[PDB]
Design a protein around this ligand. Structure first.
Ligand SMILES: [Mg+2]
Ligand SMILES: [Mg+2]
Ligand SMILES: [Mg+2]
Ligand SMILES: [Mg+2]
Ligand SMILES: [Mg+2]
Ligand SMILES: [Mg+2]
Length: 191
RNA sequence: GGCAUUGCCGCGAAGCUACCAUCCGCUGGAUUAUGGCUGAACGCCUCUAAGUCAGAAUCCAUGCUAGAACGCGGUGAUUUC
């Protein structure tokens, strides 16, 4: 309907500095620095009061104003990643064969190694994206935690780990073995 | 020794040749379907709309064959009369 103006607000907490050149967004917080290239969306950023960034689409269509809120959510996720962090908890699920998950090194690349999935002899190797920390959770059986500033990076690593453990040539409603994302939250608690 | 239109028979080197013999037949990317991530649209949801991951005997490359006889480069020597 070609809305004249549509805008969204990006709240910036105190310990966060957001540098926005043309469409290269850099967010700096306690936990590190994130960078995103948004040159494919054609939006306009403006700083209001050093705690608020407005992002606007002028004379935008339906898809354009949808992508505006997408941009706002992406920048909010960058800020949340540099303030709270992002942690995805996955639980290994298996009926008979225990799934052995470990961190191995190959040329200093820190792969996640999956052995014995459904009794397989094949060894699954999922590379760990830079910035993603892998921890094996004590006091919870068969739980892997992936943490990082970039929600995209941690979620993609969890997705890769889940997808590498897909069951083939079997009724997946019966053979439920795999490594599934069980929780998606932040690193810092109750903030 | 000749002839029998290579007279016939056995063996027969060379050459040619047989899954009737032996050897050899490569690995990278991008993708389809599909399964996903982030994520609005549509306070939720959503693989999709922006962006994005993986992925087929597929495609393009690597590799192999020919080398444009009007595509090109480097290089040697260039007629004592
Ligand atoms: Mg069957
Ligand atoms: Mg005679
Ligand atoms: Mg004779
Ligand atoms: Mg999701
Ligand atoms: Mg798309
Ligand atoms: Mg020629």
């Amino acid at each position: 309907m070609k809305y004249i103006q549509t805008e969204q607000q990006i709240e910036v907490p105190e310990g966060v500095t957001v540098s926005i050149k043309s469409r290269i967004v850099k967010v700096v917080g306690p936990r590190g620095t994130l960078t995103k290239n948004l040159k494919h969306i054609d939006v306009t950023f403006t700083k209001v009061n050093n705690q608020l960034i407005k992002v606007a689409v002028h004379n935008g269509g339906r898809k354009h104003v949808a992508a505006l809120r997408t941009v706002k959510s992406l920048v909010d996720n960058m800020i949340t990643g540099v303030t709270k962090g992002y942690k995805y908890k996955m639980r290994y699920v298996y009926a008979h064969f225990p799934i052995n998950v470990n961190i191995v090194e190959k040329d200093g690349a820190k792969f996640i190694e999956v052995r014995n999935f459904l009794g397989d002899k094949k060894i699954r190797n999922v590379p760990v994206r830079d910035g993603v920390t892998i921890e094996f959770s004590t006091n919870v059986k068969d739980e892997i935690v992936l943490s990082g500033n970039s929600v995209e990076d941690v979620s993609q690593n969890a997705a890769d780990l889940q997808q590498i453990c897909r069951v083939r040539n079997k009724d997946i409603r019966k053979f439920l073995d795999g490594i599934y994302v069980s929780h998606k939250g932040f690193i810092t608690e109750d903030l």
